[PDB]
Amino acid sequence: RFGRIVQMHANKREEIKEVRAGDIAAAIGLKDVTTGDTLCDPDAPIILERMEFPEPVISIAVEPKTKADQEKMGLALGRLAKEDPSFRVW
Amino acid sequence: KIRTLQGRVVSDKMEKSIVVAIERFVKHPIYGKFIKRTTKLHVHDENNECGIGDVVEIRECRPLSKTKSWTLVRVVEKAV
Amino acid sequence: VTSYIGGEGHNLQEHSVILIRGGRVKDLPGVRYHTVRGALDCSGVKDRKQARSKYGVKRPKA
Amino acid sequence: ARYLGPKLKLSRREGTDLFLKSGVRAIDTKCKIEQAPGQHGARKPRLSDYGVQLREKQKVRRIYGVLERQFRNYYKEAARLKGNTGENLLALLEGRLDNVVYRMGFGATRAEARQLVSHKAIMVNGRVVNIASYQVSPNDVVSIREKAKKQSRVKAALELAEQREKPTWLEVDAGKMEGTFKRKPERSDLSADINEHLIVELYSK
Amino acid sequence: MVTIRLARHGAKKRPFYQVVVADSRNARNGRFIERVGFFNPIASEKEEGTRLDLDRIAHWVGQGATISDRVAALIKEVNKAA
Amino acid sequence: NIKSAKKRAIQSEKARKHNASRRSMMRTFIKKVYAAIEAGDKAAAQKAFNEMQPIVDRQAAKGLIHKNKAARHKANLTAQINKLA
RNA sequence: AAUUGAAGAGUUUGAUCAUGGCUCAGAUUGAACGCUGGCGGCAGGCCUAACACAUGCAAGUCGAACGGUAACAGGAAGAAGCUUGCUUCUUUGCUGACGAGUGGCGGACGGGUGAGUAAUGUCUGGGAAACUGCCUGAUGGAGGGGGAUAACUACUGGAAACGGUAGCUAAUACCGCAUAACGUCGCAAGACCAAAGAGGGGGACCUUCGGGCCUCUUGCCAUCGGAUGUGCCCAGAUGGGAUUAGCUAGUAGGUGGGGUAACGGCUCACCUAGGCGACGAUCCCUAGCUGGUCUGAGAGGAUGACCAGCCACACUGGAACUGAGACACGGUCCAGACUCCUACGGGAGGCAGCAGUGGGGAAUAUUGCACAAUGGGCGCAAGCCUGAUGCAGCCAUGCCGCGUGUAUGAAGAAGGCCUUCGGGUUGUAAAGUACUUUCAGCGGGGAGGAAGGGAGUAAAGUUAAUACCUUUGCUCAUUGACGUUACCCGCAGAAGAAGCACCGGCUAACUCCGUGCCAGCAGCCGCGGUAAUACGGAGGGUGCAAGCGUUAAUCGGAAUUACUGGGCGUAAAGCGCACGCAGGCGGUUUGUUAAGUCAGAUGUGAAAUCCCCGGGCUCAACCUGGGAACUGCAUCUGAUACUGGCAAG
C-alpha cells in the first residue's frame, strides 16, 4: 500500500495526495521496503534501476546495565537495523 | 378501590407527622420460613389526632416532605 | 517463588527472563510452579523425540 | 480427519468384519482377522466394563468413520428428539448420505462410497450434494449425475451389492441408478449385532 | 418523531430485516417500540417473504408516525388488496 | 476543535448578552414590586404589578422564561398584595 | 406436542468398616503457551495502566431565510486577431449554481468505557404535584411600523490565533405597538401576551415597466389533546466484614418568603426536639445493575464478555451559559497537572470515537474500502456528510462442514522391531493395476443483495385556468462498495495437504535396549538400589483430529455448608451450669377479620437468548415464523380449613 504522502520540509509534515515524476516525497506505512528499492507500478511493465551496496568497517560491542533491557536491546537496535544499510548486528 | 395500607403507629413525638410500621409476612427465598418483615414509613397526616398503638389506614400521595409521602385516612382501634 | 526445571540440561543462570506455569512438584516441599520449556531464555530440551509438546522440542526435519 | 490409514486393522481390533474392505476379493481370508491387531494382540485382556463400552462405541463409529466431535453431536441430537435415544441415535445416523448411498448399493465400501459423494456426482432429489453428512429426509428420492455416470466404479457396486442381502426400506432402480428412500429406519431393520445401551450409558458421563 | 423503519439482522452477505416501530433518535437494531412485520430481500421461493402487520401501521399513522422509504415501498410492493 | 459549527459559541455569546440584560429587566421590575410590598402603599404596588405584567408575559412568548414560571410570578404578586390590602 | 431426567474411581491399615479431606474421569472459555498446521462458512478478537498519546478522518447541511459571488460555467452590448461573425477579451449577479458571513435546524443521536457508584443508581410493580424540538389532530389568526448589526468597505494591530477603529446594506435575526380567545393570574370584575414571510405557474385588470392580483406549495404564532421521550415520588429486591455500636445537626417535621418545568429542606428565616438503628444504622473493603451466559436432574453456585435496556464518566476538580432537551466526548469559562507552536509579545489541545503508537502484560488485529443497501442529521427535492453501518484484512481463539483418495493387491516383499530364534509382527500396510478427481491452482460463463431516484408522457385530482403542485399507473436509459463475488462449466493430474498426547493402577493400549535412589517422571497413589510395561530411546498399540495436549478459570462429581439434601457419647463439634429481655414457636372452643394461604380473572413479565413443531443457505454451524416459556410481580373479586390479629370462654 501507500498510506500517507508527505513533502517533508526538514522533518515537518504537510500532506500530499498525489505525486508526480521528479518530486521528492515520503511514503508512510510500507512495511517491507529496503534501501534503494525500485517501487514500480503493478498490473503493468516492471522496471529496475538499483545497483549498489556500500561497505561496513569497524565492529565493536555492547552490554546493557541489566538483562531486563536485553529484549529492548535486540528490539531498539533492531529498530535501528531497518534504517541504515551499512550498520550490521552480530 | 385504591391502594391503602393498615400499619401501626410508632413514633408520634412530633407535629403533623407520623412514622407508621406495616408488617409483611413474606416468605424467605431459600429457607421457606415466614419472617415478620417490618417496614417503617414517614406518613403525613392532618392536625395532631391520635396516639401510639392504633391501626391506621394510609394511602400513597404527593411527596409532602423530604420523606413523608403518604396520607392517613382514618384511625381505628383506640386503646390505652 | 520457586519453580521446577523439567527435562535435563538447562542453560539457566543468575538472570534470565523466563515463563512460569503452575503445578505441584509434590516430592519437592514448597515448590509450586513449573518453568515452561519452549518459552523465553529457558530453551528447549537437548533432543527428545518423545512427548515434545511439553519441553518444547521441535519436530525433527524430514 | 477422515480415517486415512491401514484399513482392516480396525476389524482385527474388533474381531468381526464391519465390511470395510469388501471390494473384489469378497472373501476376507487374506487378513488373519481377530487375533493380531499388533505385536502383542495375540492374547486376551480381562477387558473391563469401560473398555467393553468403548469398543462397542468404536464399532458403530468405524463403519461410518464418524469422528468423536461429529459423533457426540448425534447423541446430543438423539436425546433431544422424542422416542428412544438408543433408537434415535442409529436412525439419524442411517440418514447420512453415504449411509443411504451404501444401503442403496451405490458404494461397495464406505470409503469408495464417500469418494463418489465428496466429488459431487449424486443429484439427490433435484440438487447435487457433495457433503456426506447430509440428512436424507424421509419420503424422498436420490439420483446420480448422468454426465459422470458409469465409470466402472458404479457397475462393480451394482454387481456386488445385489449379491448382498438386498436392503429393505428403499428401492434401487438397478438399471440406471435411481435410488428412492421411503420410510423411517426401524430398530428391527438393522445389522443387529450392534448394541445400543452400551453407547447411551457411556455418554451420560 | 416515532418512525416505522427497518432493522437489519442476519449474517454477512445474507441479510434480513424486521420492520419495526421505533423512536427515530435511537439506534437501528437497538431500542424500539414495537416490531410490526418483517421482510426478506433474499427470500428464496417460498411465499413467506413479508408478513406486515398492516392494522397497527395504519393505527400508528393516526398517532403521527413517519413511515420510512422502503417500508412505504414494501406496502406498495405488498398491496392493500392482498 | 476548529470544526465549523464553532460559530455556535459566538452565536451563544450574543444570545446570552441579549438574555441577561432582558432577564435582569424582568427581575428589576420584580424588585420594584417587592420594594412596594416592604413599603405597603397599595397603589404603588398595584401599578407596578400592572406595569410588569405585559413585560413578564412577553418574554414567555420569546421563551426565555417558562410560562408556568411567568404564571407563578403573576400568582406571587397578587397573593402578597391581597393579604396586605 | 414445549425439560424421556441424577453412575463413579484412587487414597490412611497387616486386613476391615466408617468419619474425613486431597485427586481424577465431564462440560465450559473474550483464554494464553508448546508442538503442528490444507480450505471454506458464521462468530469473537485490550480481561492488565480511566496509562500518556504523534498523524489522518469521527457532524454537517440549508440559495425554497438573506445581503451578496471570492471561485466555475453561461446567454450576453461589445473586443480584436483578421480563416468579416471564426474568436483574444471587456461589460454585467441578469441565469444554473456557490465559498466568507448573518440567520434556521442539528451538533444533548449515534459511537466509547466501566474509574466512580452498596444506593442519588439498577431490576420489578405502582403512583402524582410536571415538561416534551421535530412528527400529528382540532380550533383561529396570520394588522401595522421601527432601530441597529454583521458581511462588506477606508485606516490599522499581529508571526499566527484573533482582532481593534470609523462608516455601511439585508434577513424566516432582533425590538416595541395594535389585537385578542375555550389562554395566565384573580372569589370576582377585569388586566395582560403572539406571529414572517419565502417557492412555482398564470387568464385578465393593473405594470411607478419590480410588483400588486389569483391559485397552488410551504412555513409561521396562540390554546386544548395524541404520540414519543424526559424529570420525580413510593414499596420490595439488589455484596463481604460486628476484630464496624451507636449514629445525624439543614440533620427529623411544622410555618411563612423565595426557589423549582413540576414535588420536596430543594434554599434561608423562626419555631418544635426530634429522625435512623440488632429485620444491621454509621463505618471500612470490593463492585456498575439487568435481560441473561456457564454449569447443575432440579434447587442452587459462579459470573455480568459479545448482542440489547438502563446508569455514570469524557485529562483531574468546580461552576454556569445556550437551548425543546446538556450542567454537555469531538462546546464555554476558571483552577491544577502534562504536552505542542513561537517572531518570546502571545496562543493551542484532550483517542474512555475508528484505525494506529510507546508502554504494562502470558494475552488480542488494518493508520484499509464504499456511502451501493439499512438507519440518522439538514433540505422541496436532487443531493451532501456519516470510522453508525455494511464489507474487506490479519489471528485455528471458538463452533460447524470438508479434504489429504478409492478399489484391487501376498512372493505374504525389502527394511525395522522382536523370537523358548521353528516363526511372528509391521501389514494389503507399500510397490504395481484400474478408476474417481471435490476444495486448492487455471481459463470462461453468472445470480441476488436494487427498493428507489432521474427525464418524459397519459389519467384523476386541482383551481376562475387544460398552468403549477399532488397521486396514479407507463416507457426509456440507469444505481453494486464487496467482487478475477455466491454459484456454475470445462483443463491437467493422485497430485498441492497429518499431526499432537498417552500406554503401572485410576484409564482405552506393550515388549526390547540403555540406565542403576543416578539421569529424571508425576493430577493422586507412588516408580528408579543392575531383568523398570511408570525413567529416557526405538518398535508396537490406543485415543483425538486441523487440531492435540499444558496451565489458568468456574460449576459439577462434593449429600466435603447438606433449602431440596449432613452432623454433635468415643471420629471435628453440647457453652461448666443457671436465670432471663429481643426474638422463634406455642394446648383447647366459639364468633369475627382475610394479613399470610389458596382458586379464578386482568395488566404486565421489552426483544433476543433457552426449549418444541416448521422454513431458508447443497448439509451443518447459522439466520429466521408462530407457539410455549419467562415458574415472577402487582392489582382486582372471591373460599374460611390451617397460621396470624382481635373479642369471649
mmCIF file of N, CA and C (backbone and C1' of nucleotides) in Angstrom, chain G residues 348-389:
data_model
loop_
_atom_site.group_PDB
_atom_site.id
_atom_site.type_symbol
_atom_site.label_atom_id
_atom_site.label_comp_id
_atom_site.label_asym_id
_atom_site.label_seq_id
_atom_site.Cartn_x
_atom_site.Cartn_y
_atom_site.Cartn_z
ATOM 1 P P A G 348 -6.216 30.187 22.335
ATOM 2 O "O5'" A G 348 -5.483 28.862 21.830
ATOM 3 C "C5'" A G 348 -5.431 28.530 20.424
ATOM 4 C "C4'" A G 348 -4.928 27.116 20.227
ATOM 5 C "C3'" A G 348 -5.638 26.033 21.026
ATOM 6 O "O3'" A G 348 -6.855 25.632 20.402
ATOM 7 C "C1'" A G 348 -3.297 25.727 21.192
ATOM 8 P P G G 349 -8.067 25.059 21.295
ATOM 9 O "O5'" G G 349 -7.652 23.550 21.594
ATOM 10 C "C5'" G G 349 -7.414 22.620 20.517
ATOM 11 C "C4'" G G 349 -6.751 21.367 21.041
ATOM 12 C "C3'" G G 349 -7.496 20.640 22.150
ATOM 13 O "O3'" G G 349 -8.502 19.796 21.591
ATOM 14 C "C1'" G G 349 -5.203 20.828 22.717
ATOM 15 P P G G 350 -9.835 19.456 22.430
ATOM 16 O "O5'" G G 350 -9.527 18.033 23.079
ATOM 17 C "C5'" G G 350 -9.002 16.960 22.271
ATOM 18 C "C4'" G G 350 -8.282 15.950 23.133
ATOM 19 C "C3'" G G 350 -9.149 15.166 24.112
ATOM 20 O "O3'" G G 350 -8.610 13.853 24.251
ATOM 21 C "C1'" G G 350 -7.543 16.418 25.311
ATOM 22 P P C G 351 -9.030 12.700 23.202
ATOM 23 O "O5'" C G 351 -9.607 11.536 24.127
ATOM 24 C "C5'" C G 351 -8.832 10.362 24.428
ATOM 25 C "C4'" C G 351 -9.140 9.274 23.428
ATOM 26 C "C3'" C G 351 -8.361 7.978 23.594
ATOM 27 O "O3'" C G 351 -9.046 7.143 24.527
ATOM 28 C "C1'" C G 351 -8.305 8.665 21.325
ATOM 29 P P A G 352 -8.255 5.980 25.308
ATOM 30 O "O5'" A G 352 -9.402 5.299 26.184
ATOM 31 C "C5'" A G 352 -10.456 4.516 25.567
ATOM 32 C "C4'" A G 352 -11.818 5.025 26.001
ATOM 33 C "C3'" A G 352 -12.153 6.450 25.589
ATOM 34 O "O3'" A G 352 -12.695 6.463 24.266
ATOM 35 C "C1'" A G 352 -12.630 6.158 27.893
ATOM 36 P P G G 353 -13.135 7.852 23.580
ATOM 37 O "O5'" G G 353 -13.653 7.407 22.141
ATOM 38 C "C5'" G G 353 -14.936 6.772 21.974
ATOM 39 C "C4'" G G 353 -15.282 6.686 20.503
ATOM 40 C "C3'" G G 353 -14.338 5.858 19.642
ATOM 41 O "O3'" G G 353 -14.643 4.460 19.709
ATOM 42 C "C1'" G G 353 -14.753 7.931 18.575
ATOM 43 P P C G 354 -13.546 3.374 19.238
ATOM 44 O "O5'" C G 354 -13.438 3.581 17.659
ATOM 45 C "C5'" C G 354 -14.368 2.944 16.751
ATOM 46 C "C4'" C G 354 -13.775 2.862 15.357
ATOM 47 C "C3'" C G 354 -12.427 2.167 15.256
ATOM 48 O "O3'" C G 354 -12.558 0.748 15.210
ATOM 49 C "C1'" C G 354 -12.336 4.208 14.076
ATOM 50 P P A G 355 -11.316 -0.180 15.626
ATOM 51 O "O5'" A G 355 -10.377 -0.127 14.337
ATOM 52 C "C5'" A G 355 -8.949 -0.246 14.446
ATOM 53 C "C4'" A G 355 -8.281 0.513 13.322
ATOM 54 C "C3'" A G 355 -6.768 0.592 13.414
ATOM 55 O "O3'" A G 355 -6.144 -0.586 12.921
ATOM 56 C "C1'" A G 355 -7.625 2.746 12.982
ATOM 57 P P G G 356 -5.046 -1.332 13.827
ATOM 58 O "O5'" G G 356 -3.942 -0.211 14.065
ATOM 59 C "C5'" G G 356 -3.203 0.340 12.956
ATOM 60 C "C4'" G G 356 -2.406 1.541 13.404
ATOM 61 C "C3'" G G 356 -1.542 1.341 14.638
ATOM 62 O "O3'" G G 356 -0.333 0.647 14.357
ATOM 63 C "C1'" G G 356 -2.731 3.361 14.851
ATOM 64 P P U G 357 0.368 -0.216 15.517
ATOM 65 O "O5'" U G 357 1.068 0.890 16.429
ATOM 66 C "C5'" U G 357 2.064 1.771 15.873
ATOM 67 C "C4'" U G 357 2.579 2.734 16.921
ATOM 68 C "C3'" U G 357 3.131 2.140 18.207
ATOM 69 O "O3'" U G 357 4.458 1.642 18.042
ATOM 70 C "C1'" U G 357 1.770 4.011 18.721
ATOM 71 P P G G 358 4.942 0.351 18.880
ATOM 72 O "O5'" G G 358 5.445 0.956 20.268
ATOM 73 C "C5'" G G 358 6.643 1.758 20.337
ATOM 74 C "C4'" G G 358 6.673 2.560 21.620
ATOM 75 C "C3'" G G 358 6.583 1.771 22.916
ATOM 76 O "O3'" G G 358 7.836 1.202 23.282
ATOM 77 C "C1'" G G 358 5.112 3.616 23.029
ATOM 78 P P G G 359 7.884 -0.262 23.951
ATOM 79 O "O5'" G G 359 7.184 -0.067 25.373
ATOM 80 C "C5'" G G 359 7.619 0.969 26.282
ATOM 81 C "C4'" G G 359 6.553 1.250 27.319
ATOM 82 C "C3'" G G 359 6.093 0.062 28.146
ATOM 83 O "O3'" G G 359 7.001 -0.212 29.209
ATOM 84 C "C1'" G G 359 4.208 1.290 27.418
ATOM 85 P P G G 360 7.231 -1.728 29.688
ATOM 86 O "O5'" G G 360 5.846 -2.116 30.377
ATOM 87 C "C5'" G G 360 5.440 -1.511 31.621
ATOM 88 C "C4'" G G 360 4.108 -2.073 32.063
ATOM 89 C "C3'" G G 360 3.976 -3.586 32.002
ATOM 90 O "O3'" G G 360 4.604 -4.231 33.102
ATOM 91 C "C1'" G G 360 2.033 -2.595 31.105
ATOM 92 P P G G 361 5.487 -5.551 32.849
ATOM 93 O "O5'" G G 361 4.425 -6.656 32.397
ATOM 94 C "C5'" G G 361 3.339 -7.038 33.267
ATOM 95 C "C4'" G G 361 2.252 -7.750 32.490
ATOM 96 C "C3'" G G 361 2.660 -8.999 31.722
ATOM 97 O "O3'" G G 361 2.753 -10.160 32.544
ATOM 98 C "C1'" G G 361 1.307 -7.649 30.343
ATOM 99 P P A G 362 3.804 -11.318 32.164
ATOM 100 O "O5'" A G 362 3.444 -11.689 30.654
ATOM 101 C "C5'" A G 362 4.258 -12.620 29.909
ATOM 102 C "C4'" A G 362 3.386 -13.575 29.120
ATOM 103 C "C3'" A G 362 2.446 -12.942 28.105
ATOM 104 O "O3'" A G 362 3.111 -12.645 26.873
ATOM 105 C "C1'" A G 362 1.262 -14.557 29.378
ATOM 106 P P A G 363 2.731 -11.307 26.062
ATOM 107 O "O5'" A G 363 1.176 -11.472 25.745
ATOM 108 C "C5'" A G 363 0.700 -12.501 24.842
ATOM 109 C "C4'" A G 363 -0.814 -12.537 24.829
ATOM 110 C "C3'" A G 363 -1.503 -11.221 24.494
ATOM 111 O "O3'" A G 363 -1.609 -11.048 23.077
ATOM 112 C "C1'" A G 363 -2.533 -12.204 26.394
ATOM 113 P P U G 364 -0.624 -10.027 22.310
ATOM 114 O "O5'" U G 364 -1.590 -9.262 21.294
ATOM 115 C "C5'" U G 364 -2.113 -9.920 20.120
ATOM 116 C "C4'" U G 364 -3.611 -9.711 20.016
ATOM 117 C "C3'" U G 364 -4.105 -8.269 20.006
ATOM 118 O "O3'" U G 364 -3.981 -7.693 18.703
ATOM 119 C "C1'" U G 364 -5.534 -9.644 21.328
ATOM 120 P P A G 365 -3.123 -6.349 18.489
ATOM 121 O "O5'" A G 365 -3.111 -6.181 16.903
ATOM 122 C "C5'" A G 365 -2.620 -7.246 16.063
ATOM 123 C "C4'" A G 365 -3.564 -7.498 14.906
ATOM 124 C "C3'" A G 365 -3.794 -6.330 13.951
ATOM 125 O "O3'" A G 365 -3.931 -6.839 12.624
ATOM 126 C "C1'" A G 365 -5.869 -7.046 14.819
ATOM 127 P P U G 366 -2.660 -6.851 11.632
ATOM 128 O "O5'" U G 366 -3.049 -5.803 10.496
ATOM 129 C "C5'" U G 366 -2.954 -4.380 10.721
ATOM 130 C "C4'" U G 366 -3.487 -3.630 9.517
ATOM 131 C "C3'" U G 366 -3.425 -2.107 9.598
ATOM 132 O "O3'" U G 366 -3.121 -1.571 8.310
ATOM 133 C "C1'" U G 366 -5.674 -2.789 9.321
ATOM 134 P P U G 367 -1.806 -0.656 8.119
ATOM 135 O "O5'" U G 367 -2.260 0.788 8.620
ATOM 136 C "C5'" U G 367 -3.326 1.511 7.966
ATOM 137 C "C4'" U G 367 -3.980 2.460 8.945
ATOM 138 C "C3'" U G 367 -4.888 3.513 8.327
ATOM 139 O "O3'" U G 367 -6.190 2.943 8.123
ATOM 140 C "C1'" U G 367 -3.496 4.465 10.028
ATOM 141 P P G G 368 -7.228 3.622 7.090
ATOM 142 O "O5'" G G 368 -6.562 3.452 5.650
ATOM 143 C "C5'" G G 368 -5.667 2.356 5.350
ATOM 144 C "C4'" G G 368 -6.398 1.250 4.604
ATOM 145 C "C3'" G G 368 -7.671 1.630 3.871
ATOM 146 O "O3'" G G 368 -7.433 2.330 2.655
ATOM 147 C "C1'" G G 368 -7.957 -0.468 4.946
ATOM 148 P P C G 369 -8.528 3.380 2.120
ATOM 149 O "O5'" C G 369 -9.719 2.459 1.604
ATOM 150 C "C5'" C G 369 -9.581 1.684 0.394
ATOM 151 C "C4'" C G 369 -10.902 1.048 0.017
ATOM 152 C "C3'" C G 369 -12.094 1.984 -0.107
ATOM 153 O "O3'" C G 369 -12.137 2.667 -1.353
ATOM 154 C "C1'" C G 369 -12.723 0.103 1.166
ATOM 155 P P A G 370 -12.742 4.158 -1.421
ATOM 156 O "O5'" A G 370 -14.321 3.939 -1.319
ATOM 157 C "C5'" A G 370 -15.059 3.363 -2.421
ATOM 158 C "C4'" A G 370 -16.508 3.133 -2.040
ATOM 159 C "C3'" A G 370 -17.269 4.324 -1.480
ATOM 160 O "O3'" A G 370 -17.718 5.220 -2.493
ATOM 161 C "C1'" A G 370 -17.699 2.430 -0.138
ATOM 162 P P C G 371 -17.483 6.802 -2.310
ATOM 163 O "O5'" C G 371 -18.322 7.173 -1.002
ATOM 164 C "C5'" C G 371 -19.696 7.615 -1.087
ATOM 165 C "C4'" C G 371 -20.636 6.467 -0.797
ATOM 166 C "C3'" C G 371 -22.123 6.818 -0.762
ATOM 167 O "O3'" C G 371 -22.868 5.704 -1.252
ATOM 168 C "C1'" C G 371 -21.502 5.862 1.295
ATOM 169 P P A G 372 -23.726 5.833 -2.608
ATOM 170 O "O5'" A G 372 -24.153 4.326 -2.904
ATOM 171 C "C5'" A G 372 -24.803 3.954 -4.138
ATOM 172 C "C4'" A G 372 -25.141 2.475 -4.127
ATOM 173 C "C3'" A G 372 -26.034 2.020 -2.984
ATOM 174 O "O3'" A G 372 -27.410 2.258 -3.288
ATOM 175 C "C1'" A G 372 -24.184 0.549 -3.160
ATOM 176 P P A G 373 -28.393 2.850 -2.153
ATOM 177 O "O5'" A G 373 -28.748 1.584 -1.249
ATOM 178 C "C5'" A G 373 -29.617 0.535 -1.737
ATOM 179 C "C4'" A G 373 -29.754 -0.556 -0.696
ATOM 180 C "C3'" A G 373 -30.263 -0.105 0.666
ATOM 181 O "O3'" A G 373 -31.689 -0.032 0.719
ATOM 182 C "C1'" A G 373 -28.307 -1.386 0.968
ATOM 183 P P U G 374 -32.397 1.147 1.557
ATOM 184 O "O5'" U G 374 -32.177 0.729 3.080
ATOM 185 C "C5'" U G 374 -32.895 -0.378 3.663
ATOM 186 C "C4'" U G 374 -32.482 -0.566 5.107
ATOM 187 C "C3'" U G 374 -32.558 0.679 5.979
ATOM 188 O "O3'" U G 374 -33.873 0.956 6.448
ATOM 189 C "C1'" U G 374 -30.449 -0.315 6.277
ATOM 190 P P G G 375 -34.408 2.475 6.455
ATOM 191 O "O5'" G G 375 -33.646 3.147 7.683
ATOM 192 C "C5'" G G 375 -33.813 2.637 9.022
ATOM 193 C "C4'" G G 375 -32.787 3.250 9.954
ATOM 194 C "C3'" G G 375 -32.710 4.767 9.968
ATOM 195 O "O3'" G G 375 -33.753 5.374 10.726
ATOM 196 C "C1'" G G 375 -30.521 3.891 9.854
ATOM 197 P P G G 376 -34.318 6.819 10.288
ATOM 198 O "O5'" G G 376 -33.226 7.844 10.826
ATOM 199 C "C5'" G G 376 -32.865 7.879 12.221
ATOM 200 C "C4'" G G 376 -31.583 8.660 12.417
ATOM 201 C "C3'" G G 376 -31.593 10.105 11.942
ATOM 202 O "O3'" G G 376 -32.253 10.971 12.864
ATOM 203 C "C1'" G G 376 -29.592 9.059 11.230
ATOM 204 P P G G 377 -33.062 12.251 12.316
ATOM 205 O "O5'" G G 377 -31.914 13.304 11.968
ATOM 206 C "C5'" G G 377 -31.147 13.941 13.015
ATOM 207 C "C4'" G G 377 -30.126 14.889 12.419
ATOM 208 C "C3'" G G 377 -30.660 15.916 11.434
ATOM 209 O "O3'" G G 377 -31.234 17.026 12.115
ATOM 210 C "C1'" G G 377 -28.699 14.936 10.558
ATOM 211 P P C G 378 -32.669 17.591 11.655
ATOM 212 O "O5'" C G 378 -32.324 18.515 10.406
ATOM 213 C "C5'" C G 378 -31.471 19.666 10.552
ATOM 214 C "C4'" C G 378 -30.942 20.107 9.204
ATOM 215 C "C3'" C G 378 -31.982 20.332 8.118
ATOM 216 O "O3'" C G 378 -32.656 21.579 8.242
ATOM 217 C "C1'" C G 378 -30.177 19.102 7.221
ATOM 218 P P G G 379 -34.215 21.685 7.844
ATOM 219 O "O5'" G G 379 -34.212 21.564 6.253
ATOM 220 C "C5'" G G 379 -33.542 22.551 5.444
ATOM 221 C "C4'" G G 379 -33.420 22.076 4.012
ATOM 222 C "C3'" G G 379 -34.709 21.652 3.324
ATOM 223 O "O3'" G G 379 -35.464 22.764 2.840
ATOM 224 C "C1'" G G 379 -33.015 20.059 2.879
ATOM 225 P P C G 380 -37.068 22.749 2.951
ATOM 226 O "O5'" C G 380 -37.515 21.520 2.040
ATOM 227 C "C5'" C G 380 -38.866 21.018 2.092
ATOM 228 C "C4'" C G 380 -39.281 20.447 0.753
ATOM 229 C "C3'" C G 380 -38.434 19.315 0.188
ATOM 230 O "O3'" C G 380 -38.787 18.061 0.777
ATOM 231 C "C1'" C G 380 -38.971 20.860 -1.533
ATOM 232 P P A G 381 -37.642 16.985 1.129
ATOM 233 O "O5'" A G 381 -37.059 16.535 -0.289
ATOM 234 C "C5'" A G 381 -37.883 15.834 -1.244
ATOM 235 C "C4'" A G 381 -37.349 16.028 -2.649
ATOM 236 C "C3'" A G 381 -35.956 15.479 -2.919
ATOM 237 O "O3'" A G 381 -35.987 14.086 -3.237
ATOM 238 C "C1'" A G 381 -36.092 17.694 -3.736
ATOM 239 P P A G 382 -34.667 13.181 -3.031
ATOM 240 O "O5'" A G 382 -33.654 13.693 -4.156
ATOM 241 C "C5'" A G 382 -33.964 13.534 -5.560
ATOM 242 C "C4'" A G 382 -33.065 14.407 -6.412
ATOM 243 C "C3'" A G 382 -31.572 14.136 -6.322
ATOM 244 O "O3'" A G 382 -31.164 13.035 -7.136
ATOM 245 C "C1'" A G 382 -31.949 16.467 -6.186
ATOM 246 P P G G 383 -29.873 12.171 -6.719
ATOM 247 O "O5'" G G 383 -28.689 13.242 -6.680
ATOM 248 C "C5'" G G 383 -27.596 13.118 -5.746
ATOM 249 C "C4'" G G 383 -27.322 14.452 -5.082
ATOM 250 C "C3'" G G 383 -26.275 14.414 -3.979
ATOM 251 O "O3'" G G 383 -24.954 14.490 -4.512
ATOM 252 C "C1'" G G 383 -28.180 15.579 -3.204
ATOM 253 P P C G 384 -23.764 13.649 -3.827
ATOM 254 O "O5'" C G 384 -23.442 14.464 -2.496
ATOM 255 C "C5'" C G 384 -22.784 15.749 -2.556
ATOM 256 C "C4'" C G 384 -22.693 16.361 -1.178
ATOM 257 C "C3'" C G 384 -22.039 15.490 -0.117
ATOM 258 O "O3'" C G 384 -20.618 15.567 -0.167
ATOM 259 C "C1'" C G 384 -24.052 16.386 0.738
ATOM 260 P P C G 385 -19.733 14.293 0.252
ATOM 261 O "O5'" C G 385 -19.910 14.197 1.835
ATOM 262 C "C5'" C G 385 -19.415 15.241 2.697
ATOM 263 C "C4'" C G 385 -19.958 15.072 4.100
ATOM 264 C "C3'" C G 385 -19.723 13.721 4.766
ATOM 265 O "O3'" C G 385 -18.408 13.574 5.311
ATOM 266 C "C1'" C G 385 -21.969 14.379 5.103
ATOM 267 P P U G 386 -17.740 12.110 5.392
ATOM 268 O "O5'" U G 386 -18.705 11.305 6.376
ATOM 269 C "C5'" U G 386 -18.876 11.715 7.751
ATOM 270 C "C4'" U G 386 -19.839 10.791 8.471
ATOM 271 C "C3'" U G 386 -19.590 9.300 8.307
ATOM 272 O "O3'" U G 386 -18.547 8.838 9.158
ATOM 273 C "C1'" U G 386 -21.912 9.748 8.126
ATOM 274 P P G G 387 -17.298 8.034 8.536
ATOM 275 O "O5'" G G 387 -16.901 7.015 9.695
ATOM 276 C "C5'" G G 387 -17.710 5.858 9.993
ATOM 277 C "C4'" G G 387 -17.031 5.012 11.051
ATOM 278 C "C3'" G G 387 -16.870 5.654 12.426
ATOM 279 O "O3'" G G 387 -16.838 4.643 13.434
ATOM 280 C "C1'" G G 387 -14.738 5.371 11.431
ATOM 281 P P A G 388 -17.624 4.867 14.820
ATOM 282 O "O5'" A G 388 -19.164 4.830 14.406
ATOM 283 C "C5'" A G 388 -19.781 3.602 13.971
ATOM 284 C "C4'" A G 388 -21.288 3.711 14.061
ATOM 285 C "C3'" A G 388 -22.051 2.484 13.588
ATOM 286 O "O3'" A G 388 -22.116 1.489 14.610
ATOM 287 C "C1'" A G 388 -23.060 4.440 12.699
ATOM 288 P P U G 389 -21.640 -0.018 14.296
ATOM 289 O "O5'" U G 389 -22.348 -0.373 12.913
ATOM 290 C "C5'" U G 389 -23.788 -0.412 12.801
ATOM 291 C "C4'" U G 389 -24.201 -0.427 11.344
ATOM 292 C "C3'" U G 389 -23.550 -1.508 10.493
ATOM 293 O "O3'" U G 389 -24.231 -2.755 10.634
ATOM 294 C "C1'" U G 389 -23.399 0.570 9.365
#
